[PDB]
Amino acid sequence: MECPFQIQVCISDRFFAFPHNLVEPQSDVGNKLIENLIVYVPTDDDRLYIDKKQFPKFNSVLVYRHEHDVNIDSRSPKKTASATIVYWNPLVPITEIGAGETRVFSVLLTNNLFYCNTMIVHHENPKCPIEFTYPNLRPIACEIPLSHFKELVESNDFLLCFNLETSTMVKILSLKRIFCIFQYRKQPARYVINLPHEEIDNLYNKLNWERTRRLMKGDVPSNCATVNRSSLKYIKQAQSLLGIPDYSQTVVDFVKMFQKIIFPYQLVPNVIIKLNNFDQMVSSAPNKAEPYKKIRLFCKNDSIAISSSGIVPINMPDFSPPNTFDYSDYANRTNINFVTQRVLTDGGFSSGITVTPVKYNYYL
């Protein structure tokens, strides 16, 4: 799909609250100013926090919940220049537009909004928030934000909850609402979530798609995120094997600790390889079994780079087929077997032994 001509989107996380100010009276060509204004919202709940008096510019202001009808469905929606119209963080495609070019102000890029006139006015928010789940708690009414305004400012550990009936889109909405404000907060508050989370992990994948959609025009922010099962179980286990002074210690701790040694040893930690190995997709990708996504890794001023598989010269496809080949006089089955038998005898070992020659790439 696409946005029909004469519509534009402003994304800003600040728009999580209604930006009353920005809107201006639309007019038709011929200066036919349109003080009639209608706004569509996901819920009357939204309307509860919207003041008419903000808009003395207009004499006629009304607001209703969006409903996705059937009969008007079109790539080209119905037009009605007789009133200005705005949709506020709409979830689903819109069937009618107001005076002049219509504009929408939303926090989230839906698939519907892909090919669209767009502006984001993004800015980097540094402070990544965090999850923590021990199993005192801040209980939250896990939808209405301002219910807990100042509460979220003051405390840093919050419970997250839902009734069954919630539409997946509504869940996604409210969650997305959270994280913006959290990155605005000065401290990494800890999420706690009362859900089996598997499909929630799936919608996290969807967040990945959405955020890439942003990145098509975005800030390339250093946005923290993670896989939530295949990572976490293994990381927990790894710490377990390690001394566990802080079971609560952030992963990035370990990350950068390992980082300290990269250049001096010029090689990739197994840890980071298991990362980008045990994601569904951004990894060796068990989805498709694509270790072919080897990491080529470079650092400032280097004449060379570190692959998943040793040193490489810059910007070349991991290994030239022409090579100082592992000529089969070496790595001959026969010699391999002979040496292996020597080994087995010497060990006095019945079983469980295998051997393989080393191999080499661009460099030896």
Q: How many residues bind other proteins (CB under 8 A)?
A: 14
Q: Among 140, 152, 275, 312, which residue interacts with other proteins (rule: CB under 8 A)?
A: 140
Contact 222, 123 (CB under 8 A): no
Measured from the CB atom, the residue of 28 and 199 that comes closer to other proteins is 199
Stretch that binds other proteins, among 12-20, 158-166, 175-183, 294-302 (CB under 8 A): 158-166
Collapse the DSSP code of 75 into the 3-class scheme (helix H, G, I; strand E, B; otherwise coil) and give the result: coil
Q: Is 143 in the site for other proteins (CB under 8 A)?
A: yes
243 contact partners, CB below 8 Å, separation of at least 6: none
Helix axes 198-215, 168-184, angle to 10 degrees: 60
Stretch that binds other proteins, among 84-92, 98-106, 137-145, 299-307 (CB under 8 A): 137-145
6 contact partners, CB below 8 Å, separation of at least 6: 97, 100, 101, 102
Q: Is 141 in the site for other proteins (CB under 8 A)?
A: yes
Q: Name which of 120, 93, 160, 147 is nearest 14 in CA terms.
A: 120
Query: Site residues for other proteins, window 107-136 (CB under 8 A)?
Result: 135
Minimum CB separation from other proteins for residue 2, in Å?
35
Binding mask 181-220 for other proteins (x = CB under 8 A): -------------x--------------------------
Stretch that binds other proteins, among 86-94, 157-165, 229-237, 286-294 (CB under 8 A): 157-165
Per-residue CA distances from 137 to 33, 140, 153, 177, 188 (Å) = 52, 9, 15, 20, 15
Q: Cα–Cα distance between 293 and 270 in angstroms, integer? A: 15
Q: Cα–Cα distance between 11 and 6 in angstroms, integer? A: 17
Q: Among 161, 195, 299, 353, which residue interacts with other proteins (rule: CB under 8 A)?
A: 161
Minimum CB separation from other proteins for residue 194, in Å?
6
Stretch that binds other proteins, among 139-147, 199-207, 235-243, 244-252 (CB under 8 A): 139-147
Contact 340, 331 (CB under 8 A): no
Collapse the DSSP code of 52 into the 3-class scheme (helix H, G, I; strand E, B; otherwise coil) and give the result: helix
Q: Is 321 in the site for other proteins (CB under 8 A)?
A: no
Measured from the CB atom, the residue of 17 and 161 that comes closer to other proteins is 161
For the chain, helix (H) and strand (E) counts, in that order, are: 9, 15
Stretch that binds other proteins, among 6-14, 40-48, 154-162, 260-268 (CB under 8 A): 154-162
Binding site residues, other proteins, CB under 8 A: 135, 137, 139-143, 159, 161-163, 165-166, 194
